[PDB]
Design an enzyme around this catalytic site. Structure first.
Site, PDB file in Angstrom:
ATOM      1  N   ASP B  30       0.751  -1.585   0.391  1.00 48.84           N
ATOM      2  CA  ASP B  30      -0.108  -0.183   0.338  1.00 48.84           C
ATOM      3  C   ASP B  30       0.470   0.944  -0.143  1.00 48.84           C
ATOM      4  O   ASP B  30       1.704   1.239   0.451  1.00 48.84           O
ATOM      5  CB  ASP B  30      -0.712   0.089   1.192  1.00 48.84           C
ATOM      6  N   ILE B  31       0.519   2.122  -0.506  1.00 50.33           N
ATOM      7  CA  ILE B  31       1.332   3.169  -0.331  1.00 50.33           C
ATOM      8  C   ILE B  31       0.978   4.688   0.625  1.00 50.33           C
ATOM      9  O   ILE B  31       1.813   5.827   0.158  1.00 50.33           O
ATOM     10  CB  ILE B  31       1.758   3.825  -2.225  1.00 50.33           C
ATOM     11  N   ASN B  86     -13.241  -3.713   3.753  1.00 51.58           N
ATOM     12  CA  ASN B  86     -13.333  -2.707   3.969  1.00 51.58           C
ATOM     13  C   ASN B  86     -15.255  -2.040   2.678  1.00 51.58           C
ATOM     14  O   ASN B  86     -14.059  -2.155   1.421  1.00 51.58           O
ATOM     15  CB  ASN B  86     -13.199  -0.711   3.478  1.00 51.58           C
ATOM     16  N   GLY B  92     -15.944   2.832   4.767  1.00 50.69           N
ATOM     17  CA  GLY B  92     -14.580   3.391   4.427  1.00 50.69           C
ATOM     18  C   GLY B  92     -13.869   3.304   3.009  1.00 50.69           C
ATOM     19  O   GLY B  92     -12.875   2.970   3.246  1.00 50.69           O
ATOM     20  N   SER B  94     -12.918   3.332  -0.506  1.00 47.27           N
ATOM     21  CA  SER B  94     -12.755   4.372  -1.408  1.00 47.27           C
ATOM     22  C   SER B  94     -12.425   3.615  -2.387  1.00 47.27           C
ATOM     23  O   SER B  94     -12.601   4.299  -3.463  1.00 47.27           O
ATOM     24  CB  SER B  94     -11.749   5.277  -1.076  1.00 47.27           C
ATOM     25  N   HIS B  99     -11.112  -5.442  -2.464  1.00 43.13           N
ATOM     26  CA  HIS B  99      -9.641  -5.594  -1.211  1.00 43.13           C
ATOM     27  C   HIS B  99      -9.413  -5.879  -0.687  1.00 43.13           C
ATOM     28  O   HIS B  99     -10.096  -5.364   0.341  1.00 43.13           O
ATOM     29  CB  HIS B  99      -8.386  -4.424  -2.122  1.00 43.13           C
ATOM     30  N   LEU B 100      -8.669  -6.911   0.227  1.00 41.07           N
ATOM     31  CA  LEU B 100      -7.948  -7.041   1.427  1.00 41.07           C
ATOM     32  C   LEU B 100      -6.184  -6.907   2.289  1.00 41.07           C
ATOM     33  O   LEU B 100      -5.871  -6.703   1.259  1.00 41.07           O
ATOM     34  CB  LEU B 100      -7.974  -8.676   1.300  1.00 41.07           C
ATOM     35  N   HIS B 101      -6.617  -5.926   2.547  1.00 41.47           N
ATOM     36  CA  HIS B 101      -5.516  -5.227   3.884  1.00 41.47           C
ATOM     37  C   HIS B 101      -5.113  -6.085   4.675  1.00 41.47           C
ATOM     38  O   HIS B 101      -5.684  -7.032   5.739  1.00 41.47           O
ATOM     39  CB  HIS B 101      -6.517  -3.571   4.575  1.00 41.47           C
TER      40      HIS B 101
END
Lengths: 113, 113
Positions: B30-31, B86, B92, B94, B99-101
């Protein structure tokens, strides 16, 4: 399904606020809610933590999410929600039985803890 | 693989530090990391959000988690980590491509946002 408080719940040995159940998972409200809607979806198979999940458990894990997305809709979470899996100490895993948290009913914030 | 930023990353149009890639997903850093280690695991197939995931998507979703845990182990997250998906506004979310964090490398707190 196991030697944790979650196993006792699956075995109906202790009460919980059950939302959904099938032959492979159980969804119930978290006894210590962190949002207006805060529930858990857990497999009945005792997988202590996501770090030791076998590749064969893949669809079952995906099943937890599908069941979670469905339970959220029937709990009125139309504005959004957050799914969370915690692993170990840094992840803040409170019980050693894999569990997916689903939280909504309020603006969730960033970072996620 | 989609109309979003992630679609562009999948099509190698915009750069990303890839950790893993297979026929089904892509794992990259992640950036705007929220922990020492913070990466995403996205499906190559464009599902815009988990609330619209189909029942057949369960293997692919569980695959995101199996890949996330493998990558986390590879990235040396032996003390733990947290996985986050999310959904919508309250969640939250966006970027509208599932995606999975995976966050780790520090103590994650409760509640998860």
């Amino acid at each position: 399904g196991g030697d944790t408080i979650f196993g006792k719940i699956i075995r109906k040995e202790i009460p919980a606020k059950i939302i959904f159940e099938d032959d492979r998972c159980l969804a119930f409200h978290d006894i210590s809610p962190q949002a207006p809607t805060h529930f858990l979806v857990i497999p009945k198979k005792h997988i202590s933590q996501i770090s030791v999940a076998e590749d064969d458990d893949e669809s079952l894990l995906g099943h937890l999410m599908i069941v979670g997305k469905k339970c959220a809709a029937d709990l009125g979470l139309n504005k959004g929600y957050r799914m969370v899996v915690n692993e170990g100490s840094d992840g803040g895993q409170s019980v050693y039985h894999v569990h997916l948290h689903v939280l909504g009913g309020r603006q969730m914030h960033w970072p996620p803890g």
